[PDB]
């Protein structure tokens, strides 16, 4: 390419006012709060916020 | 390409005022709060916010 | 291409005022709150906010 | 009062995409682009976006 | 009061994408771009975005 | 008061992408770009973004 962008996040402004935030987890998988994330994966598998319980 | 964009997030403004936020999980999978995420995957599988219970 | 966009999110403004937000999960899969997400997947499978209970 | 609001702006989300914006003024008064403004005035005169040419 | 708000702006999210923005002024008064402004004035005069040409 | 707010700005998120921004002024008054401003004035006159040409 010449002027390319791929897997790009730009120009973001975020505010989060939370008086109480609580997470309880037993034997599982919890994913919370992913923000402004970017990736590019070539010839492989790619997951951003993936939760899996058991196998 | 010449001026390309793919898998791009730009120009985002977000506000989140939450007085109480609670997550309880047992033996499963919880995904919460994904915001302004971008990826590009070539020749592979790609998932952003995927939850799976067991296998 | 020359001036392309694909899998792109731009120019977004969001507000979320929530006084109480609660998530309870047992043995399943919960996905909540995905906002302003973009991806492009080439020659592979791609899912944004997918929940699956068991296998 | 007990739970009052007066002269209040809340919960606003705005987007403005403009490719070209031009303002030319000679000897006058121009007011442009007022957004999400609040005031409360007690025992006095109050104007938000007021233009006046001469006196 | 007990739980009051007056002259308050909260919970605002704004985006402005402008490719070219130009202002030309001769001998006058120009006001442009006021956003998310609050005041409270007691026993006096109060103006937010006021333009006046001459006197 | 007990839990008061007056002349308050909170919880603001703003984005401004501008490729070219130009201001030219001769002999006047230009006010541009006021954002997230708050004041409270007691027993006096109060103006936020006020332009005046001559006197």
Curated annotation (Swiss-Prot), chains A, B, C, D, E, F:
- The residue intervals holding the sequence repeats read 2-16, 17-27
Effect after changing residue 17 to K: Increases oligomerization
The record's subcellular location field reads: Cytoplasm; Membrane; Nucleus; Synapse
The tissues where this chain's protein is expressed are given as: Highly expressed in presynaptic terminals in the central nervous system. Expressed principally in brain.
List positions binding Cu cation.
10
Task: Give the Phosphoserine positions (modified residues).
Answer: 47
According to its UniProt record, how is this protein modified after translation?
A: Phosphorylated, predominantly on serine residues. Phosphorylation by CK1 appears to occur on residues distinct from the residue phosphorylated by other kinases. Hallmark lesions of neurodegenerative synucleinopathies contain alpha-synuclein that is modified by nitration of tyrosine residues and possibly by dityrosine cross-linking to generated stable oligomers.
Q: What is the effect of changing residue 6 to K?
A: In PARK1 and DLB; significant increase in binding to negatively charged phospholipid liposomes; increases oligomerization
Organism domain of life: Eukaryota
Task: Using the UniProt entry, name the condition the protein is associated with.
Answer: Genetic alterations of SNCA resulting in aberrant polymerization into fibrils, are associated with several neurodegenerative diseases (synucleinopathies). SNCA fibrillar aggregates represent the major non A-beta component of Alzheimer disease amyloid plaque, and a major component of Lewy body inclusions. They are also found within Lewy body (LB)-like intraneuronal inclusions, glial inclusions and axonal spheroids in neurodegeneration with brain iron accumulation type 1. Parkinson disease 1, autosomal dominant: A complex neurodegenerative disorder characterized by bradykinesia, resting tremor, muscular rigidity and postural instability. Additional features are characteristic postural abnormalities, dysautonomia, dystonic cramps, and dementia. The pathology of Parkinson disease involves the loss of dopaminergic neurons in the substantia nigra and the presence of Lewy bodies (intraneuronal accumulations of aggregated proteins), in surviving neurons in various areas of the brain.
Q: Which family does it belong to?
A: Belongs to the synuclein family.
Assembly and partners are described as: Soluble monomer. Homotetramer. A dynamic intracellular population of tetramers and monomers coexists normally and the tetramer plays an essential role in maintaining homeostasis. Interacts with UCHL1. Interacts with phospholipase D and histones. Interacts (via N-terminus) with synphilin-1/SNCAIP; this interaction promotes formation of SNCA inclusions in the cytoplasm. Interacts with CALM1. Interacts with STXBP1; this interaction controls SNCA self-replicating aggregation. Interacts with SNARE components VAMP2 and SNAP25; these interactions allows SNARE complex assembly and integrity.
Record note on domains = The 'non A-beta component of Alzheimer disease amyloid plaque' domain (NAC domain) is involved in fibrils formation. The middle hydrophobic region forms the core of the filaments. The C-terminus may regulate aggregation and determine the diameter of the filaments.
Purpose: Neuronal protein that plays several roles in synaptic activity such as regulation of synaptic vesicle trafficking and subsequent neurotransmitter release. Participates as a monomer in synaptic vesicle exocytosis by enhancing vesicle priming, fusion and dilation of exocytotic fusion pores. Mechanistically, acts by increasing local Ca(2+) release from microdomains which is essential for the enhancement of ATP-induced exocytosis.
Name of the protein in question: Alpha-synuclein
The gene behind this protein is: SNCA
